[PDB]
CSV table of C-alpha atoms in Angstrom, one decimal:
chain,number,residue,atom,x,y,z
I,1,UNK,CA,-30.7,-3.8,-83.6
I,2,UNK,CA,-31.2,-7.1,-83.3
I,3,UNK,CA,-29.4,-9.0,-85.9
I,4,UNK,CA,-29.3,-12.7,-87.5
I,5,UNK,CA,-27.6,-15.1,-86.4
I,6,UNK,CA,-24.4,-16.1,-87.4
I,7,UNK,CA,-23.2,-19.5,-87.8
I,8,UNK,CA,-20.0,-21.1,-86.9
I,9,UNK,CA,-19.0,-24.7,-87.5
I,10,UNK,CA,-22.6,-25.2,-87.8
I,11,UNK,CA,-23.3,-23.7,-84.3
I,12,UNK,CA,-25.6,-20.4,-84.5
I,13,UNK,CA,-24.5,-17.6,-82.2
I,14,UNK,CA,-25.1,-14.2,-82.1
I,15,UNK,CA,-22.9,-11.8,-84.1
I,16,UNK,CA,-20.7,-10.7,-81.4
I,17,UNK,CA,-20.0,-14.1,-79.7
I,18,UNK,CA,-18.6,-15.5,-82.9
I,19,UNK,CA,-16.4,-12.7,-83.4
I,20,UNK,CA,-14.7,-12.9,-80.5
I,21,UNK,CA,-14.7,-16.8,-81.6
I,22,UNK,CA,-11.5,-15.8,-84.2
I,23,UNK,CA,-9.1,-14.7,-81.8
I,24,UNK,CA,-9.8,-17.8,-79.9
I,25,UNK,CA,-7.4,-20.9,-81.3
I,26,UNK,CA,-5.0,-18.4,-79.5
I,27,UNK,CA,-5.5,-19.3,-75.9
I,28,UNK,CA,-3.1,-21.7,-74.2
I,29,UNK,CA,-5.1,-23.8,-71.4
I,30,UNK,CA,-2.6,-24.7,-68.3
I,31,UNK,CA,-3.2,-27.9,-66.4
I,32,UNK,CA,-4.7,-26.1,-63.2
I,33,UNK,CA,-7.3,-24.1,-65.3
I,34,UNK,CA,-11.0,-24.9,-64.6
I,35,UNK,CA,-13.7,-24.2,-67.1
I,36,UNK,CA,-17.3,-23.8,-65.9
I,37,UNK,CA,-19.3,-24.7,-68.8
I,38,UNK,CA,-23.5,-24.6,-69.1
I,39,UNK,CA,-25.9,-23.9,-71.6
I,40,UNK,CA,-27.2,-20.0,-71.1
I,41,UNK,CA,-29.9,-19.9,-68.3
I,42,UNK,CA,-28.1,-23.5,-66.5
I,43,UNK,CA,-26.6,-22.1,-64.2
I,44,UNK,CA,-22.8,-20.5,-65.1
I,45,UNK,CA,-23.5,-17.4,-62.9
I,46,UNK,CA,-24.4,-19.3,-59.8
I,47,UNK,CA,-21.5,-22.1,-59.8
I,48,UNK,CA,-19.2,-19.2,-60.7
I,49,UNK,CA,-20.0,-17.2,-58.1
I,50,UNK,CA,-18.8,-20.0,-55.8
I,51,UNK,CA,-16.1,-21.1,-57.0
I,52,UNK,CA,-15.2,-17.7,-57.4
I,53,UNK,CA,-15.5,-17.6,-53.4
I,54,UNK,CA,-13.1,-21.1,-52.6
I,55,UNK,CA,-10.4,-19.5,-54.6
I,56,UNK,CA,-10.3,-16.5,-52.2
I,57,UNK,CA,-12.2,-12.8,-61.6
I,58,UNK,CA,-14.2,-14.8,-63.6
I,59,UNK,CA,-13.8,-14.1,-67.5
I,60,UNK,CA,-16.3,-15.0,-70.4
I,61,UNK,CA,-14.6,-17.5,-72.3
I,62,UNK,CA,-16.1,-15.8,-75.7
I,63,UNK,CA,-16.6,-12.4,-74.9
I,64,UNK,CA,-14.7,-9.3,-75.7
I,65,UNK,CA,-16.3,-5.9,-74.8
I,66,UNK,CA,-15.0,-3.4,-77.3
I,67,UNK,CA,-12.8,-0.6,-75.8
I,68,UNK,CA,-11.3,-2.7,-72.6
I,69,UNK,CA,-8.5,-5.2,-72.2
I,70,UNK,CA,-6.4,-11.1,-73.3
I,71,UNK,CA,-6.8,-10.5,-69.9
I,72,UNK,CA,-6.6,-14.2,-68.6
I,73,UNK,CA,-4.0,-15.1,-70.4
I,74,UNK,CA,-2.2,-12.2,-68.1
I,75,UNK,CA,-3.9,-13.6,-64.9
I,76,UNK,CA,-2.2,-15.9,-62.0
I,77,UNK,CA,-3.0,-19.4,-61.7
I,78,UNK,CA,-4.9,-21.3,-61.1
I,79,UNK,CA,-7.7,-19.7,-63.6
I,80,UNK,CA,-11.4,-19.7,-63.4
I,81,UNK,CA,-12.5,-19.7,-67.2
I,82,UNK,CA,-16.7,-19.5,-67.5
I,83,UNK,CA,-18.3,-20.3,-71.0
I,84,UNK,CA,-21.7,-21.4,-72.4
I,85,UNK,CA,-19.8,-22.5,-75.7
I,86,UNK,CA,-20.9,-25.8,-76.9
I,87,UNK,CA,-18.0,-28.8,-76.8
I,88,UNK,CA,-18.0,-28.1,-80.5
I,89,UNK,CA,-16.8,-24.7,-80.4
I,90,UNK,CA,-14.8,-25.1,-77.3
I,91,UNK,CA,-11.0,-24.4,-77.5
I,92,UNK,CA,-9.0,-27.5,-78.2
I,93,UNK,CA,-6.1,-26.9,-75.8
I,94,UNK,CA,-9.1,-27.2,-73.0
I,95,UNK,CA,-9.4,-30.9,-74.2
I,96,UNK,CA,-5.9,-31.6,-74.6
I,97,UNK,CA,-4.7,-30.5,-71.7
I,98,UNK,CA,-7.8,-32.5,-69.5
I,99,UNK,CA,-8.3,-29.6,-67.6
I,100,UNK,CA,-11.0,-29.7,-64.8
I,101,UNK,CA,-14.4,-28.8,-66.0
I,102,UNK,CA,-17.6,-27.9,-63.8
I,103,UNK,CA,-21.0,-28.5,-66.2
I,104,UNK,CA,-24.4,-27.7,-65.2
I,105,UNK,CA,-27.6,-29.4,-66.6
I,106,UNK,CA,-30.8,-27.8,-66.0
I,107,UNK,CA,-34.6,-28.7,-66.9
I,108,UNK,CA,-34.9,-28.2,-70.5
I,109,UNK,CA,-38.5,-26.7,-70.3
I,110,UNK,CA,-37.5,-24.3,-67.6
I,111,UNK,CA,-33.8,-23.2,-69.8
I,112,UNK,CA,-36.6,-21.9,-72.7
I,113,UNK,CA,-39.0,-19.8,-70.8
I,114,UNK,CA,-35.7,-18.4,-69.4
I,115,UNK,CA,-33.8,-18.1,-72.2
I,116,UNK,CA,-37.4,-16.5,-74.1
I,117,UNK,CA,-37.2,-13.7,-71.2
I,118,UNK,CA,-33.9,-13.0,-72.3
I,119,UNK,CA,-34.3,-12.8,-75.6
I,120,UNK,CA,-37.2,-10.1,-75.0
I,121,UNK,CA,-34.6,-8.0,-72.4
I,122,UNK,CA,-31.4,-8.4,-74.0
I,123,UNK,CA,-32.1,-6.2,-77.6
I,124,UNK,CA,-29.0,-7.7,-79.3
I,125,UNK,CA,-30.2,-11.0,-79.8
I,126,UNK,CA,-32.3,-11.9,-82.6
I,127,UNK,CA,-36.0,-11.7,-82.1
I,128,UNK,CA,-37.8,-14.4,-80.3
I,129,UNK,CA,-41.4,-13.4,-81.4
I,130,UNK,CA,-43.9,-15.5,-79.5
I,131,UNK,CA,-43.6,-17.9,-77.3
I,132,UNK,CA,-45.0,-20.8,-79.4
I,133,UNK,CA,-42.5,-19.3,-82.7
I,134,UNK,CA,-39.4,-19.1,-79.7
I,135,UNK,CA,-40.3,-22.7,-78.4
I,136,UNK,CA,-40.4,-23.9,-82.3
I,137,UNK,CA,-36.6,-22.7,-82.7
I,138,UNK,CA,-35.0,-23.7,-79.1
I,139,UNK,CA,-36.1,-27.4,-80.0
I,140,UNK,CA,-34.8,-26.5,-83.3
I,141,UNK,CA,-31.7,-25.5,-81.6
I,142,UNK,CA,-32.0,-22.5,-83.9
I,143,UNK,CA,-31.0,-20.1,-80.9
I,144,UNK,CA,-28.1,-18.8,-79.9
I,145,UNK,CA,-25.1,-21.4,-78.7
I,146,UNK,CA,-27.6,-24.0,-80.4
I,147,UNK,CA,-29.0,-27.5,-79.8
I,148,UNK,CA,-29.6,-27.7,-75.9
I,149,UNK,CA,-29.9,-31.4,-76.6
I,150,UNK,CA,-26.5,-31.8,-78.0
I,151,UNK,CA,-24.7,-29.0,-75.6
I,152,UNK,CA,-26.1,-30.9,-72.7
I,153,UNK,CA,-25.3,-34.5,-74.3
I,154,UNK,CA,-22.0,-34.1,-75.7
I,155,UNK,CA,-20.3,-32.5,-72.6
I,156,UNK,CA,-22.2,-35.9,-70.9
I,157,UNK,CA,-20.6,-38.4,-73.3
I,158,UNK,CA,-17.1,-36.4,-72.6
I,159,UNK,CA,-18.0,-36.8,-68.9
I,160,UNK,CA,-17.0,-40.5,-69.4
I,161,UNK,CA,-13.6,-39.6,-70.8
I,162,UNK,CA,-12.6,-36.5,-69.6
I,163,UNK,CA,-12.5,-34.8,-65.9
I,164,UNK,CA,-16.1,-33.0,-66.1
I,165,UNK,CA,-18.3,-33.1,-63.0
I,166,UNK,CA,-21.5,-33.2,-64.3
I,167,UNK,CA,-23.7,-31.6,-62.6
I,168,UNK,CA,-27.7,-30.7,-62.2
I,169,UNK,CA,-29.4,-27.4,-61.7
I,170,UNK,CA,-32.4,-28.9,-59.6
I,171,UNK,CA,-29.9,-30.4,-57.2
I,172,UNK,CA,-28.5,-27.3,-57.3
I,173,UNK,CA,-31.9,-25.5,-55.8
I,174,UNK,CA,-33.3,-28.5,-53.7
I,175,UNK,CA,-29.7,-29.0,-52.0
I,176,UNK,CA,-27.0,-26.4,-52.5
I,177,UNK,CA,-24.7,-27.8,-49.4
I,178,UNK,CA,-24.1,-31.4,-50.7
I,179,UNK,CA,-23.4,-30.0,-54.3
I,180,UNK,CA,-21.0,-27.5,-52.9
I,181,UNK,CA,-19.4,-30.2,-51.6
I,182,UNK,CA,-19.3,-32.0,-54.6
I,183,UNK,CA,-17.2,-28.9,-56.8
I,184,UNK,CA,-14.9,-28.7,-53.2
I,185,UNK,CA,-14.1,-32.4,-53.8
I,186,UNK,CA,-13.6,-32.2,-57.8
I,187,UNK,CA,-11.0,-28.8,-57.3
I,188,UNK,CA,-9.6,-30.4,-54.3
I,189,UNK,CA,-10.4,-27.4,-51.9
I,190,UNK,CA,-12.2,-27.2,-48.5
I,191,UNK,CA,-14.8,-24.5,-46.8
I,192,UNK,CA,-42.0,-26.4,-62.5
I,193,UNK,CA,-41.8,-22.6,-62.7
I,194,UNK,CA,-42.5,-23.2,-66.6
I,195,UNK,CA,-45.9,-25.0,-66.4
I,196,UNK,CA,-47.2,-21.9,-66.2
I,197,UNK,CA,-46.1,-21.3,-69.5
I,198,UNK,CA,-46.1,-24.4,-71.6
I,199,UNK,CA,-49.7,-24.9,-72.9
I,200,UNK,CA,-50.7,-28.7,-72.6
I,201,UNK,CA,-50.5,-29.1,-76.6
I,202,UNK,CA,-46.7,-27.3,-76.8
I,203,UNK,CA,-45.9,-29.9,-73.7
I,204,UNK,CA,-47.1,-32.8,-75.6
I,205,UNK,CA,-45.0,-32.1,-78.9
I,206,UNK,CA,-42.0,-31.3,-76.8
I,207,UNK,CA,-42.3,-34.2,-74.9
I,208,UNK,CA,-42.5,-36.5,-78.4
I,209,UNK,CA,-39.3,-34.6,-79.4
I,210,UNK,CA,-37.6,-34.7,-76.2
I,211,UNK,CA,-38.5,-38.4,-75.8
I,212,UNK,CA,-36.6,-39.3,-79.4
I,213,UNK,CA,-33.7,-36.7,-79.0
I,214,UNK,CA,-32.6,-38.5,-75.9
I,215,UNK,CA,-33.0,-42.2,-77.2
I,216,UNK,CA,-30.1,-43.6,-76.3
I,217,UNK,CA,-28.3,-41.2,-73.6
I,218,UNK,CA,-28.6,-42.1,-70.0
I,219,UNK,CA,-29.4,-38.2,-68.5
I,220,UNK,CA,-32.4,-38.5,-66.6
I,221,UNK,CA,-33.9,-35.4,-64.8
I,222,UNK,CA,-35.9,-36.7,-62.2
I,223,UNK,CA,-38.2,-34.5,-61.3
């Protein structure tokens, strides 16, 4: 009906998402668990849908749809755990017990027209209005799951001390082989769309803000 969003350690979701966040300092991470982790619209789909493919289920970290089944907690290792929760919000026992994480980084600019397209399909979220209020809030990180600055910088900075291959949605598109390769070596296993949309004077002032944001943080997305 599309309702507020609801805040939770200073991280705005939407209303069912942080629900489903209660029941979640439950969960018991083994050592063989692997967590692919992006920001929405970076790519969480695609990677799962591989790695869902070397294994031979793929559960929603946060989600919980009413009336079925929790259910990876009942499930045979080694687990396949997908999110788009922020390293904030993430369950600590992922962190304590260094299990193997797979992030995805994609072009800020092309995350919010994708994430705007959402917004209009997907009738639970909160309204995204126009484009220009929509790209006024996502460099607000006033959306849900947040800042896409610190989601994508934080899980970088853990990168350095913690076993996350950190990896890039262009590379992703320009090169799939070699990056397959890439999550086959980390499990140990073997086998400008948004120009169109940015008006030069909304690509200016997200530029400035992009440009001060990342001061000091070595991600570069070479384009």
């Amino acid at each position: 009906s599309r309702p507020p969003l609801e805040y939770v350690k200073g991280v705005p979701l939407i209303k069912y998402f942080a629900e489903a966040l209660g029941p979640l300092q439950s969960f018991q991470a083994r050592p063989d668990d692997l967590l692919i982790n992006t920001y929405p619209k970076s790519g969480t789909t695609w990677v799962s849908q591989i790695l869902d493919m070397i294994y031979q289920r793929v559960p929603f970290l946060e989600v919980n749809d009413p009336g079925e089944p929790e259910t990876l907690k009942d499930t045979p290792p080694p687990r396949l755990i997908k999110s788009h929760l922020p390293l904030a919000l993430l369950p600590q026992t992922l962190l304590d017990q260094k299990v193997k994480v797979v992030y995805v980084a994609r072009n800020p600019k092309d995350v919010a027209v994708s994430y705007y397209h959402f917004h209009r399909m997907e009738k639970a979220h909160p309204e995204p209005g126009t484009w220009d209020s929509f790209l006024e809030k996502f460099m607000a990180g006033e959306v849900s799951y947040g800042s896409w600055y610190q989601h994508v910088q934080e899980w970088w900075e853990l990168s350095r001390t913690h076993p996350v291959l950190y990896l890039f949605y262009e590379d992703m598109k320009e090169n799939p082989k070699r990056e397959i390769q890439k999550i086959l070596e980390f499990v140990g296993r073997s086998l400008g769309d948004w120009k169109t949309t940015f008006t030069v004077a909304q690509n200016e002032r997200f530029d400035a803000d992009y440009a001060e944001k990342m001061a000091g943080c070595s991600l570069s997305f070479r384009s």
